[PDB]
C-alpha cells in the first residue's frame, strides 16, 4: 500500500564556462517518469514512463514552465550561497534538492520530505512536521530566517500534503499495471573454485521490482556475515533490479550453505542451495 512520489534536482555551476546546468528527475516508487535538462538540445520536461505520455500538451508545457522556473531559482541560490560562504568566483559548486510525498501502508498520506545539500553536504531541511527547518550551519540559518519570515514551510506543506498526493494517486492509477504489481526475483546460485581449499558461492536475484531486497547466507541455518560480500542493488535497465551476495566457503562444505531471499514479491522468504 505504501508508495512515494520523489523528485531529485541538481544544479552545477561552471564559472567562466557559462551559467549553471540544471537537471531534474521524478519517480513514482522506483520507476522514473520525467526528466528535464537545461543543457539539452531543446530543454523541456519529457516523459520517461508510458503512464504520463497521455497527460496532454498542456500538462507538459506547465511542467516545462516549472522546471525552467526552478533552474532560474537555483541560479540565484548558487550565487547567494557563494556569498554566504565568502567563496571565490572561480570554483564550481553543486546544489541538490530532494522532495517527495509518501503514502503509508494503508494508502493514506503518511509524510513528506524536502531537503537540500550544497557541495555534497547537508544545507537545510524541512523537519518532519513540515512546519519548521533544520539549518546545518550559520549560512543555512540565513536561509531559515528568510523562509521563516516568508512562511515558506506552509507553501511546501500545502504541496506535499495536497497536490503531491493527488498526482501520485493519479499516476498510480494510470500506471497500475506496472506500478502496483511487484515482480519476484528470479534466483540462482553459482560456484567458483578459488584454491585447493576455498570456493565462492554467489547467490543471485534478477528481474525484481521494487528494488528493496535482502539476500543472506546461512551455514547450518545460522546467519553468516563475516565472509559475505554484497554488491549494491543495481538497475537492469528495463525497470527491474539485480543484486548478488557471495560467500567464501571451504571446498567440500558447499552443501552446508543456504541463501535466503526476502522480497515483497515473494509470499514467504526463499531458501536456495548450490545445485551442481
Amino acid at each position: 500500500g505504501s508508495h512515494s512520489m520523489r523528485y531529485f534536482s541538481t544544479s552545477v555551476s561552471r564559472p567562466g564556462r557559462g551559467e549553471p546546468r540544471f537537471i531534474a528527475v521524478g519517480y513514482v516508487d522506483d520507476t522514473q517518469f520525467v526528466r528535464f535538462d537545461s543543457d539539452a538540445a531543446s530543454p523541456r520536461g519529457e516523459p520517461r514512463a508510458p503512464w504520463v505520455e497521455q497527460e496532454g500538451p498542456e500538462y507538459w508545457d506547465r511542467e516545462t514552465q516549472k522546471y525552467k522556473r526552478q533552474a532560474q531559482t537555483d541560479r540565484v541560490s548558487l550565487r547567494n550561497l557563494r556569498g554566504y560562504y565568502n567563496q571565490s568566483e572561480a570554483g564550481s559548486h553543486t546544489l541538490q534538492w530532494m522532495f517527495g510525498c509518501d503514502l503509508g501502508p494503508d494508502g493514506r498520506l503518511l509524510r513528506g520530505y524536502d531537503q537540500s545539500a550544497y557541495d555534497g553536504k547537508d544545507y537545510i531541511a524541512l523537519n518532519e512536521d513540515l512546519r519548521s527547518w533544520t539549518a546545518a550551519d550559520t549560512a543555512a540559518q540565513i536561509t531559515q530566517r528568510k523562509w521563516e519570515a516568508a512562511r515558506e514551510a506552509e507553501q511546501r506543506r500545502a504541496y506535499l500534503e495536497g497536490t503531491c498526493v493527488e498526482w501520485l494517486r493519479r499516476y498510480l492509477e494510470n500506471g497500475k499495471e506496472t506500478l502496483q504489481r511487484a515482480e519476484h526475483p528470479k534466483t540462482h546460485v553459482t560456484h567458483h573454485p578459488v584454491s585447493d581449499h576455498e570456493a565462492t558461492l554467489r547467490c543471485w536475484a534478477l528481474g525484481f521490482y521494487p528494488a528493496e531486497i535482502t539476500l543472506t547466507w546461512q551455514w547450518d541455518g545460522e546467519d553468516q556475515t563475516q565472509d559475505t560480500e554484497l554488491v549494491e542493488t543495481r538497475p537492469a535497465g528495463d525497470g527491474t533490479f539485480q543484486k548478488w551476495a557471495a560467500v567464501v566457503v571451504p571446498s567440500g562444505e558447499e552443501q552446508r550453505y543456504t541463501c535466503h531471499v526476502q522480497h515483497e514479491g515473494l509470499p514467504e522468504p526463499l531458501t536456495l542451495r548450490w545445485e551442481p
Binding site: M5, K66, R69
Partner: peptide
C-alpha cells in the same frame, strides 16, 4: 507533478 520554490 513538479513544484518550484523559493530561493535559498
Amino acid at each position: 507533478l513538479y513544484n518550484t520554490v523559493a530561493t535559498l
